Amino acid sequence: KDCKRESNTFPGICITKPPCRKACIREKFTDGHCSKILRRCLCTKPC
């Protein structure tokens, strides 16, 4: 399974995936996705 950490750079409410993914790759993770409930951008990468 992957490691996960909230994005430090993504601003505002996480609505769609691509912007979150882009922030997370800029933060040297491999993907990102919006949290379904709190709408935070969560980055993921192999641990």
Ligand X SMILES: CCCCCC(=O)OC[C@H](COP(=O)(O)O)OC(=O)CCCCC
Interface residue list for ligand X (CB under 6 A): 1, 4, 6, 12-13, 15-18, 33-38, 40, 42
Calculate the alpha carbon distances from 24 to 15, 41 in Å.
Answer: 15, 8
Closer CB to a second copy, residue 4 or residue 22?
4
Spatial distance between the Cα atoms of 32 and 47, rounded to a whole number of angstroms: 14
Residue with tokens 């996480």: 14
Q: Which of residues 2-41 bind a second copy (CB under 8 A)?
A: 2-6, 8, 13, 15, 29, 34, 36-37, 39
Asked if 17 and 7 count as a contact pair (C-beta separation under 8 A), the reply is: no
| Contact positions vs a second copy (CB under 8 A) | 1-6, 8, 13, 15, 29, 34, 36-37, 39, 45, 47
